[PDB]
């Protein structure tokens, strides 16, 4: 989408790995804000927004949490409560033509700031003062949006680099996004301490002989005494007995 | 016409302040991209300063952390305050209205010739 | 920040023919730029800005033309009065930026 035209969207309710990311691209701007890069695919999330654009080569430092500017300040702004990042990956390959892309542009001249995440589509000509040159041309009768015009010749300052933002929610948040798993191939017969889905307990597990109904996952001898557990992988019945203990 | 003039150009004795003034007419300075442009005797220009028409100015290097524009937007003009004026501020301030890429600079101001004691 | 470098410093033709002044730049200009004709005692005025685009009331004598580091101001017919100082100012980065020549002098007979 366009820098003034981004492309908003959810990601939730998903158990996201933040390093499928990794093997995509060199990914030239990589930084997160209010949550680390590295420690993502673990941290869960209300809701994950995707905004996806492209912007010129010497802008790409105007997007950024409270950053001024001329592409942060008039068409696109992320707030200073930012949770989330931003990720840019120069493409001119498939956005550079050869005597100007005249398809993304920016938003030169508008009346204020915007607020974060505000986008506007509005394409009217800008005023002069008194009332303007509605539909002509003249002494400053400037246009708000411009294009960028990407050709082949332009210099790494002037080349196209798509984007995407991810804005993440912290506040009251029901996790939905987010990727843990990793399970600890099974072992059994042996008292070995177990966390099964979250049930953590130590003992020997043991196959069972007991069917579980469909919507079950445990089970429970009198007195609240954990007795079993279905498998979260295979969903198979396992027993669990306390390892020998005794007096000597 | 439309034009901006502009005052307070002046001697000033080394270390001291000063403040240059640009009033504009049958164009708003609030919604306009704002530039003051210097030149010093007899060499070249320089962009010195910009302020946006949403507010958000700039200044270059060589004169920043000194000089700041501001505008009267009730009124329709712009101002530039200086101060710590050194040797090498001794020049000619210019007043202007800047398009860009749709049409470069042409409104400029009469200007205003600002040197020092010594 | 590219520098512009204007050429020759001087230029005496005989009145009622063609100028030629270059303007050189060192990175990429492709049309974002302007010509200044500064006539002495004033601020400059715009003749030609982009590549090409003769800046409106500006007399046609004057055509525009370069691309990418190289740009070049032609005066079709020099009258007395078209001695002055120019200049070519790049704006290839606009908010907020410009960058200056050394300025051409132009002069008559």
């Known amino acids: 989408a366009s820098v003034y035209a981004w492309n908003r969207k959810r990601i939730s309710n998903c158990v996201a790995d933040y390093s499928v990311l990794y093997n995509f691209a060199p990914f030239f701007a990589f930084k997160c804000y209010g949550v680390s890069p590295t420690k993502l695919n673990d941290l869960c999330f209300t809701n994950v927004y995707a905004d996806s654009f492209v912007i010129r080569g010497n802008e790409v430092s105007q997007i950024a949490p409270g950053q001024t500017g001329n592409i942060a300040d008039y068409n696109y702004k992320l707030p200073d409560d930012f949770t989330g990042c931003v990720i840019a990956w120069n493409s001119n390959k498939l956005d550079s033509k050869v005597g100007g892309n005249y398809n993304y542009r920016y938003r030169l001249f508008r009346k204020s700031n915007l607020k974060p995440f505000e986008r506007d589509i509005s394409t009217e000509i800008y005023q002069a003062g008194n009332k303007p040159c509605n539909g002509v041309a003249g002494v400053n009768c400037y246009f708000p949006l411009q294009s960028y015009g990407f050709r082949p010749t332009y210099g790494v300052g002037h080349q196209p680099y798509r984007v995407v933002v991810l804005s993440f929610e912290l506040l009251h948040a029901p996790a939905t996004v987010c990727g843990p798993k990793k399970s600890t191939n099974l072992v059994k017969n042996k008292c070995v301490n177990f966390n099964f889905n979250g049930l953590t307990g130590t003992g020997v597990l043991t196959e069972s002989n007991k069917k579980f109904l469909p919507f079950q996952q445990f089970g429970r001898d009198i007195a609240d005494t954990t007795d079993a557990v279905r498998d979260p992988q295979t969903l198979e019945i396992l027993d669990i007995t306390p390892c020998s203990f005794g007096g000597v | 016409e439309v034009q901006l003039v502009e005052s307070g150009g002046g001697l000033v004795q080394p270390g001291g302040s000063l403040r240059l003034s640009c009033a504009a007419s049958?164009?708003?300075?609030?919604?306009?991209?704002m530039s003051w442009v210097r030149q010093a005797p007899g060499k070249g220009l320089e962009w010195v300063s910009v302020?946006?028409?949403?507010?958000?100015?700039f200044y270059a290097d060589s004169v920043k952390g000194r000089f700041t524009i501001s505008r009267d937007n009730s009124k329709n003009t712009l101002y530039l305050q200086m101060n710590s004026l050194r040797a090498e501020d001794t020049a000619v301030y210019y007043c202007?209205?800047?398009?860009?890429?749709?049409?470069?600079?042409?409104?400029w101001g009469q200007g205003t010739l600002v040197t020092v004691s010594s | 920040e590219r520098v512009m470098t204007q050429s020759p410093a001087t230029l005496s033709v005989s009145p009622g023919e063609r100028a030629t002044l270059s303007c050189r730049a060192s990175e990429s200009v492709s049309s974002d730029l302007a010509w200044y004709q500064q006539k002495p005692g004033q601020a400059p005025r715009l003749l030609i800005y982009g590549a090409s685009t003769r800046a409106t009331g500006i007399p046609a004598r004057f055509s525009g033309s370069g691309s990418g580091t190289e740009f070049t101001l032609t005066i079709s017919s020099l009258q007395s009065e078209d001695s002055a100082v120019y200049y070519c100012?790049?704006?290839?980065?606009?908010?907020?930026?410009?960058?200056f020549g050394q300025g051409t002098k132009l002069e008559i007979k």
């Open positions: 100012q790049q704006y290839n980065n606009w908010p907020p930026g410009y960058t």
């Open positions: 202007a209205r800047d398009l860009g890429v749709v049409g470069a600079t042409d409104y």
């Open positions: 049958g164009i708003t300075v609030s919604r306009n991209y």
């Open positions: 302020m946006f028409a949403g507010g958000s100015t």
